[PDB]
Each structure stands twice: as structure tokens, then as C-alpha cells.
Amino acid sequence: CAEFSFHVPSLEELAGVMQKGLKDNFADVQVSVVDCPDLTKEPFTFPVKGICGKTRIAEVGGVPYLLPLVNQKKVYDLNKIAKEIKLPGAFILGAGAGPFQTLGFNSEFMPVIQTESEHKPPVNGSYFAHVNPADGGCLLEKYSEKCHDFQCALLANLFASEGQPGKVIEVKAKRRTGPLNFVTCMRETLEKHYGNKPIGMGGTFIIQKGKVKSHIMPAEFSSCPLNSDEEVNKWLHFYEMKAPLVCLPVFVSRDPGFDLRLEHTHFFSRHGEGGHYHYDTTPDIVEYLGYFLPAEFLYRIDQPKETHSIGRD
Ligand SMILES: [Zn+2]
């Protein structure tokens, strides 16, 4: 496990940098520093009220453990990861592959977890999405119904905090007028402004209106190696899904040298739709509402020794 210290501006500073960027991409933008809303309420319904306190990102494993051929031995425990990143009782959000070792099929994982500590009873509020073997569509389930553990597999991009109320950056962006998705626009704005001083960010956003391109991985792994993005995209199942969607992004402006996934966003909803976010497909009507914080630290766990740049969209 490697630790890296991010650059951490004010709140006020980031807000102003992100607004100017987003204004180039979207017609109606507002970014401001606000009190975090109570995230135990709808539409989030997290096990904790906020995303503040001891913020950090964990990048665990990677796409090179999935592709070209899968190493199914690469299994992880998110409760244990919390201790590894020096925050027992961390509240964890983000995106990863689901635990096939408990579920019995592949899936997209939406970790939403109050991990265990001496003062915090654990709650696994995670969701998982997998390809319906009936009609090829999306089946979204709450992990705790099917399994009672903290497992995931292969790769995870996570934003961890103490889950406390406090100040966060609120982003309102409506009507896309440029080619970037919501997350890419933010990440690329931060990199353009800050350069050599890396910034990491996470939290949650709602797609309130519009549709998106997403994907879900098939229930079983390929026998043959998936050696290119074209081959990977043929194996993956793609969808158009509709608002409202609750999204969990993790993004980093510049990789200081840890073989990072720079952008990764998974989502769930109350209407049976979830998976891996690509972009919105209705730019004139799309509405995003986000709550974000910068990360103080990056932790790199089980970085692949053998790597490549395939399959990172
Ligand atoms: Zn994904």
C-alpha cells in the first residue's frame, strides 16, 4: 500500500475553478460551497449524513486484473481496505467490480459502506448491477439482501471519509453545450488549472433529468483474451438508462505515477437501473446536481505489476 499526499485548496478556491470550467461545457451552471445535505434522506439514502472528515481516495487493483484475461483470485474486503488506508470506520463510496466469489456471477458494484470501527456499527448499503439472463437488461439489487459481507473484486475506485456533516462543493450543471461528460469536464478543468499539483475528488451526484449511455459486464468472464478497447466493448453490454440516477464518481486531475484510473463513475436508482456511466445522451435537457470534496490522500493498494491501457473508459 502506497500513500500519496494530494494538493488541497480551499473549498472556495475549487468552487471558483470548477464553475469557470463547467460554464464552458454547460449552459446553466452554479458551483458553491454549501452545508452538505442530509445524505440519509432521499434520493441518496446513505447510512451516514455526510461526506466530510479525513477525506481520501483508494485505488485498489485495476482493470489489468480483469483484462485481457481475468485473475479471479483478486478479491478484496472493503472493511479491511478502510483499515489499510488508515481510516477504520470510514464511509466508502465509489465504483468497482462486484464480488463474483459471493454472488456467483459478475456484476458492476456500487459500494456504499459504513465500515466497522469501535464506535461505528457497520452497514453495507451497496448496490450491484448485472445482466439479466432473461432479456439481456439490467438487474439492480441491494447487496445486503443477497450477502452479508464486505466483499468486492478485481478493482475498486473509492472515496472515503468520516461520513460527517460539514462544508461541501455543490455543483449544479444543466443543459450540456460541449462534448465532455459531467465528470470529465470537472477533472479536466482541475488539471488545466493546477497542473503538477494533483487533485483528487469524490462524492455523489444525481442525474435529475435526461438519459445516459452506461454499461454492465456480462455474468461470466471471457475464455479468450480481450486485447483491445474494441474487443472489450463487444464483450460489455451497453444501455441507455434514464433519470433519476444516483452516481458515485472518483476522479483525479493528474496521475503522479500510480497507474490510476483517472475517472470512474457507477450509479444506482430506485427504478432498477444501474451500472458504469459513460456520458449523457440528451445534452439539451440533462440536469446534474453534485456534492463533492477534495481528497487529502491517495492510497494505492495492490497495484498491478503487469499493466496496460486497455479497457479504461
Ligand atoms: Zn466501471
Curated annotation (Swiss-Prot):
Its cofactor is Zn(2+). Keywords: Cytoplasm, Hydrolase, Metal-binding, Nucleus, Zinc. It is found in: Nucleus; Cytoplasm. InterPro entries: C11orf54_DUF1907. The keyword Zinc applies. It comes from the Eukaryota. Its EC number is 3.1.-.-. One of its GO terms (cellular component) is nuclear body. GO terms for molecular function: hydrolase activity, acting on ester bonds; zinc ion binding. GO terms for biological process: DNA damage response; regulation of DNA repair. Exhibits ester hydrolase activity on the substrate p-nitrophenyl acetate, in vitro. Regulates DNA damage and repair by regulating HIF1A degradation via chaperone-mediated autophagy (CMA). PANTHER family: ESTER HYDROLASE C11ORF54, PTD012 PROTEIN. This is Ester hydrolase C11orf54. It comes from Homo sapiens.
